[PDB]
């Protein structure tokens, strides 16, 4: 277990190549891209990436637009809230 | 703060010795 | 315009050298308001001062 002691957990493939900075950055993006996210409908952690921006929940069978490497991006989470607050305020 | 500034000056000498050893290595 | 205003009390002189005395002036020629008015020169109570720009009141606040 813990076959890779350091943060070469998904970046073991690159081997001794590309430099530490690129591999560290890839750890975060790669782990996020192949992670399972919770579908806002199925409520099951089954959302996986099909392409950059496209995420599908295997059980809910629903495709949703998202960030390239995460189902939900921080800017988007804030925008949904701003649009909700402004909408509720207008009505 | 002479003691605070004196610790800072030892740090610099410690780095210079630590780095000089690597060039010698 | 020059106004006539007499001293009401001769207060202790300030000015850092003691030169300028403090005096209270009631415009005997009008509404009698006793505004404080700093004075340079020897003064005694009831000496009339003819000036009263009236755009200035003295500071004696401690």
């Amino acid at each position: 277990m813990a076959k890779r002691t350091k943060k070469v957990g998904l970046t073991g493939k690159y081997g001794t190549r590309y430099g530490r900075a690129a591999r560290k950055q890839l750890l975060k993006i790669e782990t996020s891209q192949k992670a399972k996210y919770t579908c806002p409908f199925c409520a099951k952690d089954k959302v996986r990436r099909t392409a950059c921006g496209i995420w599908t929940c295997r059980s809910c069978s629903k495709t949703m637009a998202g960030g390239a490497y995460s189902l939900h991006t921080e800017p988007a989470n804030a925008a949904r809230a701003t649009i909700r607050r402004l909408r509720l305020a207008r009505e | 703060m002479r003691a605070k500034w004196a610790k800072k000056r030892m740090r610099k000498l410690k780095r210079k010795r630590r780095h000089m050893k690597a060039r010698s290595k | 315009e020059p106004i006539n205003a007499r001293v009401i009390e001769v207060l202790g002189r300030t000015s850092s050298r003691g030169g300028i005395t403090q005096v209270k002036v009631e415009f005997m020629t009008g509404e009698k308001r006793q505004i404080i008015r700093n004075v340079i020169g020897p003064v005694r109570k009831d000496d009339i001062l003819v000036l009263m720009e009236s755009e200035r009141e003295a500071r004696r606040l401690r």
Binding site: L26, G53, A65, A68, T73, A79, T82 | - | -
Partner: protein, 197 residues
């Protein structure tokens, strides 16, 4: 194929006739298959809906904004990009928006925009890592890659050209009124160099 942002097939009813018409839209984040998207002057402020910018309230993140009314899309179309409503002048029927660049544009209040931030956000955060990953991205776009520096090329091929050592020769800065084959380095640079801010 060449766009990072996901697209979306939204089917509207045919108003003109009896069938169903399919529209292709740049997808805001959060839109899902089987969503109901309303494009109208009387449309609610939900992500996906298209409403005129006067109707959109100030501070709202908008994307696929129209530069001029009935232009069917122009500004804020790339992954992650958005425009924000800054102010509405109801006398001039104009709305100030801040383009993703920061530049503020006064567009007609009639111009339409899709509520939301384009999806695909944070695509350039990942390093390309290998030349091969670049070749795959550019193959879906145009022959612009790989890039040879002009100081690498011979005197004929580029103005930077070549000598005994690889040097730009004269200053890289070129005038805005250069000639079409002469504008090659930094065109009309107001300033050059790395700096604070």
């Amino acid at each position: 194929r060449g766009r990072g942002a996901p697209l979306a097939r939204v089917q509207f009813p045919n108003m003109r006739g009896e069938g169903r018409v399919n529209e292709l839209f740049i997808a805001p984040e959060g839109m899902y298959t089987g969503q109901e998207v309303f494009s109208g002057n009387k449309a609610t402020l939900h992500i996906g809906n298209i409403l005129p910018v006067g109707n959109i309230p100030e501070g709202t993140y908008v994307c696929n904004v129209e530069e001029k009314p009935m232009d069917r899309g122009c500004l804020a179309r790339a992954s992650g990009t958005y425009c924000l409503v800054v102010a509405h002048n109801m006398e001039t029927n104009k709305t100030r928006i801040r383009l993703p660049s920061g530049q503020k544009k006064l567009i007609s209040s009639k111009a339409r925009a899709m509520i939301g931030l384009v999806a695909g956000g944070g695509r350039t955060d990942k390093p390309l890592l290998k030349a091969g990953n670049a070749y795959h991205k550019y193959k879906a776009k145009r022959n612009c890659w790989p890039v040879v520096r002009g100081v690498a090329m011979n005197p004929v091929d580029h103005p930077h050209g070549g000598g005994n050592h690889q040097h730009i020769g004269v200053s890289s800065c070129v005038p805005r009124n250069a000639v079409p084959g002469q504008k090659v380095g930094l065109i009309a640079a107001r300033r050059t160099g790395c700096s604070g801010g």
